[PDB]
Amino acid sequence: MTIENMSVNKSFGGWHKQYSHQSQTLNCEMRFAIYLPPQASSGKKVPVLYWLSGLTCTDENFMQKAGAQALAAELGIAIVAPDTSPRGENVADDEGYDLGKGAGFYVNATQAPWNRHYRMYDYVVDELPKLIESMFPVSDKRSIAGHSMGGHGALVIALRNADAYQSVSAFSPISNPINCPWGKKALTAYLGRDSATWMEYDASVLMRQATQFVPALVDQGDADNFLVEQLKPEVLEAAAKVKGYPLELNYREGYDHSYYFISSFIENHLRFHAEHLG
Amino acid sequence: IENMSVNKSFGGWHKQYSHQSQTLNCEMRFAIYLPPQASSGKKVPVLYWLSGLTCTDENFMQKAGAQALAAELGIAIVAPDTSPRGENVADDEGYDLGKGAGFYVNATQAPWNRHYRMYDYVVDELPKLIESMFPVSDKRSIAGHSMGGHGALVIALRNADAYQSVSAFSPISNPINCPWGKKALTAYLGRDSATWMEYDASVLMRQATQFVPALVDQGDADNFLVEQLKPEVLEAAAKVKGYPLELNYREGYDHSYYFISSFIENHLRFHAEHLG
């Protein structure tokens, strides 16, 4: 498992770093970003928040635009931002913004040609966390969060792995991918048509049958253009009523889908995770 | 004027406007952050932010994380573009000349004198436009990065009564004596240095009679520090007449918005103090 620094920018007394490594799970070369807070350099091992980004994103978007480093440094949380898909000339793609590169939908693809590289689930749950721990001053305590496609992945991963994560939050998540266009196209391509394996990757289906509980916080913009068609936050609200799952879901009046929304509430999300990580 | 886009941000509004500039003879884009207090009937003061080479109005708005403390302190922020834009506008495919590279001067040389009056745009046309179209007071400060830092200090030093305070991140301190500055000044104003002296932060500061409170942060691991930015000349220029310049070298900090973001809070509080 070969890894090399690509970049370093000091940030609020700590360090934003990009690395490339050879991913065995994704069978390709991957870029991720880490933010280490000032308390990482002062002997203390810090908790980690994994951040999953949405369609079209790389690791750069969150790190540059979310404004999270300031409160990560004050609270003492490492942030890890993976990429959104395998990358490389051998990696299956689709010209569509909503399928392929930038669009791995945090699943383990079983169908060809996707099954050659698209194991973004295994990468985020298994490989990346073991690589981070062996390399950086991070504790065993981890949480997960993300935006849109990334909110889908964060919720799915936390609901399937409740022992391994202390908390989960999401902005504008794809709540019910088995019944929305983005969801249907990508789960069709990667898992096969209709296919019961879809139910392993749908937050609102999983939250209904859920046993062990992970505290969940969800922020949704009122003025988000994808609210009705893609995101379906009200299906996640209804999923939580079945078992009494610990979901807090907030509708923010006038907020859109953008990093201007995310940046506006990332503090609150960071305090919520610091609470459960502490 | 036309509102191109709008995004709620920290209880207020990030907005992109395009308008037709008479001073630049082209279609211009600027961005404004209006804090919550703007929609509470109180006229807010304005910080103008000038960006560096290759930037639009989007870089500072998306990367600096200034909205949280602007919303807290009640400051409106205006980010002009860094040059004229449009296929009617003269360009050079060099990154350090023409589009994205205005150097905040009034060009007198062809082909540049038709479009490249970014000094006039920032000092006259844009503020008259902000004050007529937005609930803002006539109180303003100016700040910038690199080329924008050069632009901020030069504008403040030459318009001392118009600006309450000035700050900069990694300014081009002494443009008459760096490659970026000579190339742009030669192209925009011609080869005779006598016309450059009015566009050099260090030269103006050394002769300054009227003080505008000044704060500068410089990352000491900045790849442009030695060749282009020359902060040491701005320190030396402040010693001559006792200019109120606070200048910090920040250990390990680079040129990027990771540096700017790390200290933008100190800058917003500096400007709040002087705007109030």
Numbering used by the authors:
A (entry chain B): 1 to 278
B (entry chain A): 3 to 278
From the paper:
S-formylglutathione hydrolase (SFGH, EC 3.1.2.12) is a member of the esterase family and is also known as esterase D. SFGH hydrolyzes S-formylglutathione into glutathione and formic acid and can be broadly considered an esterase, or more specifically, a thioesterase. This enzyme is involved in the glutathione-dependent formaldehyde detoxification pathway, which prevents the negative effects of formaldehyde by a series of enzymatic reactions involving formaldehyde dehydrogenase (FALDH, S-hydroxymethylglutathione dehydrogenase) and SFGH, which depend upon the spontaneous binding of glutathione to formaldehyde. Sequence alignment analyses have shown that SFGH has a conserved sequence motif (GHSMGG) that harbors catalytic serine; thus, this enzyme is also referred to as a serine hydrolase. In this study, we characterized a novel cold-active S-formylglutathione hydrolase (SfSFGH) homolog from a psychrophilic bacterium, Shewanella frigidimarina.
